[PDB]
Symmetry: C3
Subunit: 40 residues, 3 copies
Amino acid sequence: APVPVTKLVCDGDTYKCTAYLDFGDGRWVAQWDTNVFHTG
Amino acid sequence: APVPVTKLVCDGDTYKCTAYLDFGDGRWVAQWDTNVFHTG
Amino acid sequence: APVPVTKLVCDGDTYKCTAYLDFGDGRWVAQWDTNVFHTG
Ligand SMILES: CC(=O)N[C@@H]1[C@@H](O)[C@H](O[C@@H]2O[C@H](CO)[C@@H](O)[C@H](O)[C@H]2NC(C)=O)[C@@H](CO[C@@H]2O[C@@H](C)[C@@H](O)[C@@H](O)[C@@H]2O)O[C@H]1O
Ligand SMILES: CC(=O)N[C@@H]1[C@@H](O)[C@H](O[C@@H]2O[C@H](CO)[C@@H](O)[C@H](O)[C@H]2NC(C)=O)[C@@H](CO[C@@H]2O[C@@H](C)[C@@H](O)[C@@H](O)[C@@H]2O)O[C@H]1O
Ligand SMILES: CC(=O)N[C@@H]1[C@@H](O)[C@H](O[C@@H]2O[C@H](CO)[C@@H](O)[C@H](O)[C@H]2NC(C)=O)[C@@H](CO[C@@H]2O[C@@H](C)[C@@H](O)[C@@H](O)[C@@H]2O)O[C@H]1O
């Protein structure tokens, strides 16, 4: 079931974003690959 | 063009995150595959 | 290392979401491909 994201972070060493989820004991995350770059 | 996200959810059954968008009739979403897992 | 997201936007022309990061000079983003579609 869809559950809300309580905090979103991203990481330019791992090239992943991690979404902390509201569910159960509070220790579930969603995580996906991303590009990370400097604008301008 | 980039539009704001009003709410972000993720789902450990479908392995998707869904971003509700502020645009048009209010019923547009962005969605992507994700990993979902327990930590700790 | 993980850094906070300050703003999340998504774009139905590019089919990407972009996360502005709290890091460094403030001009780093994470960006990933997404589906974008109308619901209901
Ligand atoms: C002089 C200095 O410290 N420059 C920093 C860059 O080194 C750093 O870019 C990463 O550098 C490592 C090598 O140390 C590479 O393996 C990565 O591929 C580089 N990442 C990117 C996206 O270019 C940048 C960026 O820092 C990274 O991304 C941030 C958003 C954050 O997650 C940091 O923790 C992460 O290291 O920062 C310069 O200051
Ligand atoms: C006893 C009990 O209820 N255990 C729950 C797990 O079943 C559940 O893990 C999912 O289980 C289904 C089969 O029922 C699998 O098809 C999924 O692959 C499992 N998902 C994961 C990520 O392991 C877990 C996790 O719940 C899921 O993810 C949450 C973040 C949330 O989105 C839930 O709605 C979703 O079902 O929870 C245990 O309690
Ligand atoms: C009459 C009108 O303006 N209709 C709009 C649609 O054209 C638009 O759908 C995009 O249309 C372009 C060509 O104009 C296509 O290349 C895209 O593939 C279409 N995208 C999608 C997702 O269908 C829709 C949706 O607008 C897009 O997505 C929004 C979330 C936002 O990012 C917009 O800036 C973006 O154009 O909107 C209709 O109103």
